[PDB]
């Protein structure tokens with residue numbers, strides 16, 4: 001493909017290097033396409049990027065759903081999303097470039113929106129897990145969206161700022177977190 | 187001192203033009219030193235920067251040591267510390283140079299090493315709060331180190347990936363997170 005091979009060469013660079021470090025110039029040399037190509041379907045560079053994120057968030061949200069069946073209760077679902085959060089190959093590997101990208105575009109306006117429309121996807125899983133939990137008496141959440149946002153973000157943190165110490169040390173902590181968090185809800 | 191003038195000057199240079207942009211040449215002239223002296227004190231720009239970050243860390247600790255008298259109980263110190271982490275980052279000058287530095291150096295294990303020595307120092311604040319909380323029976327934690335690493339990274343997540351929301355909502359969520367987490371410890 002073309003408008004899909006670019007979307008893939010970019011992802012690899014955005015991850016390997018960073019948001020800025022990777023240039024549309026580069027993208028082309030390893031994806032063979034006139035500069036203009038990147039223009040029709042991808043307007044700005046924060047377009048091609050804000051794009052990939054969508055794909056990633058979707059792919060991950062999908063992987064989770066074809067994977068949460070292994071969890072009988074929501075308490076189990078919560079626990080599992082956070083673990084899987086550490087192993088996926090989706091979305092999370094791009095948290096870094098996201099951090100950078102937001103620092104180099106917070107001064108514009110179209111940023112706060114997209115960078116908040118996608119936030120609704122990001123926290124969805126937690127909203128479902130938490131609402132359903134109320135619909136199932138596992139706990140009693142009055143401020144679900146508050147709790148869902150706090151959860152999502154907290155977790156992203158553990159996943160993102162412990163990226164190095166042996167992969168199982170992470171899974172350990174992550175579970176202690178899911179533990180403590182839930183015990184604090186009810 | 188001439189070493190400190192270089193640190194001083196370098197810190198500012200970093201604040202105004204960011205990391206990747208500042209050159210040791212500028213640092214040399216503006217601090218009235220030399221390539222040689224700069225080399226003897228830090229070897230490289232990356233180490234120079236790390237040295238600054240260390241100074242910053244100490245200042246922060248010194249500040250915390252004073253700021254925490256306001257919080258009588260450890261439960262209180264936990265709430266306050268997290269609030270501070272969030273509010274101060276809003277106007278931290280070096281923040282940008284840091285984001286630029288990490289998302290461009292987390293690959294090297296040498297610079298990824300010294301970095302954890304630094305992160306550990308941030309984590310200690312939690313460790314102290316938690317250890318001291320035990321000796322007053324505010325809570326009963328048998329895995330302080332664990333909980334401490336979790337809190338540090340949970341909070342950091344809430345700080346880094348929330349920017350889009352208005353400052354009050356952030357402070358509001360962060361306080362809720364401190365409440366849930368502190369509650370799930372009993």
Ligand SMILES: Nc1ccc2cc3ccc(N)cc3nc2c1
Pocket residue numbers: 239240242243246274275278284304
């Ligand atoms: N990686 C680092 C190292 C030192 C730091 C020192 C700080 C001091 C005050 C403040 N508000 C934020 C800080 N962030 C740091 C982040």
